Structures are given as C-alpha cells and as structure tokens.
C-alpha cells in the first residue's frame, strides 16, 4: 500500500491520474519524482521548468554543480539528484526531444531508467514540449517499465484521450 490517491489502474504496475506533478509531489512526497530533463539539466520550461520553480531554483543550483563536475547526460540517460521539497529523490531522465531531431527509439532507453526504482511518480517522457506523441509515450512506458509507476498528466483533455485510447 502507498499514498497515491485517485489513480486509474492501467496495468499490473502502471497507474495514471489527471494531476499537476508539482502539486502531486508536494502532497505525496514520493520517494522518487521523475523530471523531464535535458542533457544539460537546464530546467527552463515544461515539466522541468515547473518542478524547478517549485524548489525555488534549488534544483537548478544543484543541477549546475552536477553538470560542472560530470558533464552532460546522454539522451536516454538519467541521474539521481535531490528531490528538494518535492520528493526524497529526483530522477532526471532525458527523453529524446523531437523538436531537436533526436531518435525516438531512445525513448525506450529513457524509460528503462525507471526500472532502477521500485516506485516512481513520473510524466510521459518526451511529451509536451519535447514533441513526441503522448499516446506513444504511454505505450513505450507500459511495455518497458516493470516497477510501479504513477503517471501524472497535467492536461485534462490529454488525460481523457490517453485513457480512452489505451489498449
Ligand atoms: C506544470 C506541469 N505539470 C505537469 N505534470 C505532468 N506532465 C506535465 N507535462 C508533460 C506532458 N504531459 C502533459 O499532460 C503535457 C505534456 C507536456 C504533453 C506537466 C507540466 C507542464
Ligand atoms: Cl515537459
């Protein structure tokens, strides 16, 4: 049993809810919140910009130190950093950005990072301003993630479409 409330069960291990991941994290304080990151951990917009704002820019400060030490992530890669006031940990995962020409086959590699954590709160990778089809992102998620993933979908219209089209 966990504290996630109001989710629709899609599969054995995947759950979905129309919710702002920021407000959901502040309420649940999960062990792991997933950020829709880029390789430079520049959290300007989309989910990343929103999560960072909720930490009062502490996420960005920590991220800049991480990059100064380690260099950029790989597309499809991830790193674990602090969850600040939102979660114990933040798993920064780089889905491919279609508006940059990045290979969509890397979306599966991106979701594989979730399997290193028993339970996570997460957005659909490469959705929103990353330019991929959210229906496809949900499908890759279901077919790749084996640990327990709670998806927060901000847009109500999109959430309804994702549920009604789910096979
Ligand atoms: C403030 C905020 N909270 C979120 N919580 C979950 N997902 C988010 N966006 C990623 C993709 N999922 C969507 O519904 C829209 C999308 C960009 C296609 C967000 C955002 C921008
Ligand atoms: Cl986003």
Curated annotation (Swiss-Prot):
Changing residue 31 to A: In strain: Mu/B.1.621. This is Papain-like protease nsp3. May form homohexamers. Interacts with N protein. It is found in: Host endoplasmic reticulum membrane. It catalyses: Thiol-dependent hydrolysis of ester, thioester, amide, peptide and isopeptide bonds formed by the C-terminal Gly of ubiquitin (a 76-residue protein attached to proteins as an intracellular targeting signal). It is a multi-pass membrane protein. Residues 1-167 form the Macro domain. Inhibited in vitro by GRL-0617. Responsible for the cleavages located at the N-terminus of the replicase polyprotein. Participates together with nsp4 in the assembly of virally-induced cytoplasmic double-membrane vesicles necessary for viral replication. Antagonizes innate immune induction of type I interferon by blocking the phosphorylation, dimerization and subsequent nuclear translocation of host IRF3. Also prevents host NF-kappa-B signaling. In addition, PL-PRO possesses a deubiquitinating/deISGylating activity and processes both 'Lys-48'- and 'Lys-63'-linked polyubiquitin chains from cellular substrates.
């Amino acid at each position: 049993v966990n504290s996630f409330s109001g989710y629709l069960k899609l599969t054995d291990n995947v759950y979905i809810k129309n919710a702002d991941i920021v407000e959901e994290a502040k309420k649940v304080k999960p062990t792991v919140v997933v950020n829709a990151a880029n390789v430079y951990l520049k959290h300007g917009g989309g989910v990343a910009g929103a999560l960072n704002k909720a930490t009062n820019n502490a996420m960005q400060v920590e991220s800049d130190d991480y990059i100064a030490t380690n260099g950029p992530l790989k597309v499809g890669g991830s790193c674990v950093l602090s969850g600040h006031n939102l979660a114990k940990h933040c798993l920064h995962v780089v889905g491919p950005n279609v508006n940059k020409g990045e290979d969509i086959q890397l979306l599966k590699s991106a979701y594989e990072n979730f399997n290193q954590h028993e339970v996570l709160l997460a957005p659909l990778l490469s959705a929103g301003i990353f330019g991929a089809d959210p229906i496809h992102s949900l499908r890759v998620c279901v077919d790749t993630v084996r640990t327990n993933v709670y998806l927060a979908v901000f847009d109500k219209n999109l959430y309804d479409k994702l549920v009604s089209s789910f096979l």
